[PDB]
Structure 1
């Protein structure tokens, strides 16, 4: 049973700005997804200190970067805290409303798109490089879900039946035709080194077969 939802007006507006504005420094999307993974990893590590049974769904805390030239996808996987159904549909959209507002005003005052993380809405920077985004996520005490959007004002949420994942979040970027430089090992390494060199979790860059 696939449910279809409208984005809140401000998020739709932000997504259009991101997709439509001329801005050549697209590489910052990666820093933002890795930073989101790090925050979700911090959250489950904190919670596990007062309740050790929260790591029964997996003890390892890490990030995998997985490019696939065949599918033309870049996948970021973390074993962070995960998201509930209520996160995917309501809560995250609600929190982002004020950050979007402030970000959009700041851009009029001479700030640039690369400052998006400072406003808590870095996730939407994925649309700099991706025509479609899919998020598979599993939170303790709740089922696995798939969220998906190609923008255009809507997103979908369903119960996920694919490979079960224990706990955490997997973001799948279906890249735009002219953005395949981000499947190259060398380019990905250069970007991680420049923008994400002090993340406190191991980051494994998978190599492709062919």
Structure 2
């Protein structure tokens, strides 16, 4: 039970806990830097945010300490007391793959050090909570390594790993550096981290693993993105965007209770997650961030809804997704087919929602067809067009509930006989979509079906 299912689902990469606590640190710092803008005292001492990693080979413990927003006993109770922010939970329990005891100690931002929180668990089922006095604010996680997990006690190996999960993080990730220097012990801290907000760096110098690690960072997805697009704009609109396209559709995609939007930053200051006013509905699947100069620091989820600057930004961002997608479509056909398998049904509600970009959208669509006796929705409108017979004016299509149903079940033999190709639309939404996508490249569509004799 405990063993198997995970030894294969999560234990795959037992380093997972590490690329989470660090991610949590990179977010706790963000929140703090946002509160402290208008409330300097929160920094109460050190304003140089960083996450520190260190180990005690003798005591067998790895520690990760950050000085960000820290937590409240309620915030803690909430994440670790699940059943009789989110990543912290995953990272915590995920740590047990490599640890038999994980201990947390945190004191909140702007709080009496006497209001610190202490939470511990030896894995199993019994935890330990306690109010305590924590001097420096932030969160500190101490792991007690199991036998055989001594790789997290080797300066080299540990350093190396940490790198793999922070080159994309802006928060400095410092590693302890003791050096036996005359008599006493000189304790230093050097940073492994390049420490610059990813979207801030020049595309030229960002590795693919960095873009990929960064996607998993903001989207909270174990999978890699299919493509992305990094763009910096100046002038009319001044902002920086970095948008992704997953490779697997999230479970909450087909729900009224979403998970969509872009991560919003203003003047490099974090504002909120899931700013849904930035992408139209037919692009719910896009993930990414936007860092605007033209938006106030005090923007409201409410403001963006009636915000013109936002609509303008949304329109611009919309076209980038469409370009990204077409570039993918020409650059790597195999991944686009993946895209289409995961999101084709979401993209089909675009012709009725976005007609300024209708042509573009239509080019990204794929269809099943008579041109191959398979149901592979591999056919593109342009392809269809290129194969039309001389004298053919219309793009023919049939609608049904099944590929099968629409294939040899209708009355398309006249067309078959004339050697004309017929799109075989068979998705629940196709019928509705065809009310808005009425012509492509100057050639109008037309269905086959019953009842019609002028």
**Normalising by structure 2, what TM-score?**
0.35
Query: Aligned-pair distance for 1:81?
Result: 0.6
Give the corresponding residue for 1:128.
Answer: 97
Q: Is the 8 A contact 1:64 1:204 kept in 2?
A: yes
Structure-2 change in CA distance of 1:148 and 1:57 (3 Å): farther
Give the corresponding residue for 1:84.
Answer: 72
Structure-2 change in CA distance of 1:19 and 1:203 (3 Å): farther
Q: Structure 1: which 5+ residue stretches go unaligned?
A: 1-12, 101-116
The aligned length equals 174
Structure-2 change in CA distance of 1:19 and 1:73 (3 Å): farther
Q: Which protein has the larger Cα radius of gyration, Structure 1 or Structure 2?
A: 2
Give the corresponding residue for 2:175.
Answer: 205
Q: Is the 8 A contact 2:104 2:120 kept in 1?
A: yes
Map 1:31-180; keep pairs closer than 5 Å: 31-89=19-77, 91-93=78-80, 121-139=90-108, 140-142=110-112, 143-161=115-133, 164-180=134-150
Q: Is the 8 A contact 1:136 1:169 kept in 2?
A: yes
After superposition, what is the alpha-carbon deviation per residue over 1:83-116, rounded to whole angstroms, capped at 9, x for unaligned?
1111122x2247x68x99xxxxxxxxxxxxxxxx
- Aligned mate of 1:25, from 7, 10, 13: 13
Give the corresponding residue for 1:106.
Answer: none
Give the corresponding residue for 1:186.
Answer: 156
The one of the two structures with greater contact order (alpha-carbon pairs below 8 A, sep at least 6) is 1
Q: Is the 8 A contact 1:18 1:128 kept in 2?
A: no
Q: Is the 8 A contact 1:75 1:173 kept in 2?
A: yes
Q: Is the 8 A contact 1:81 1:167 kept in 2?
A: yes
Query: Aligned-pair distance for 1:154?
Result: 2.5
After superposition, what is the alpha-carbon deviation per residue over 1:119-149, rounded to whole angstroms, capped at 9, x for unaligned?
9733321111110011110112241221101
Q: Root-mean-square deviation (CA), in Å?
A: 2.9
After superposition, what is the alpha-carbon deviation per residue over 1:34-64, rounded to whole angstroms, capped at 9, x for unaligned?
1111111111111111222211253221111
Structure-2 change in CA distance of 1:133 and 1:39 (3 Å): same
Give the corresponding residue for 1:195.
Answer: 165
Structure-2 change in CA distance of 1:31 and 1:92 (3 Å): same
- Runs of 4+ in structure 1 deviating by more than 3 angstroms, as ranges, are 16-20, 207-210
Q: Structure 2: which 5+ residue stretches go unaligned?
A: 181-454
User: For the residues of structure 1 that align with 2:160 and 2:128, how far apart are their CA atoms?
Assistant: 34
**Normalising by structure 1, what TM-score?**
0.72
User: For the residues of structure 2 that align with 1:19 and 1:79, how far apart are their CA atoms?
Assistant: 35
2:135 match: secondary structure: coil
Q: Is the 8 A contact 2:18 2:91 kept in 1?
A: no
Q: Is the 8 A contact 2:120 2:128 kept in 1?
A: yes
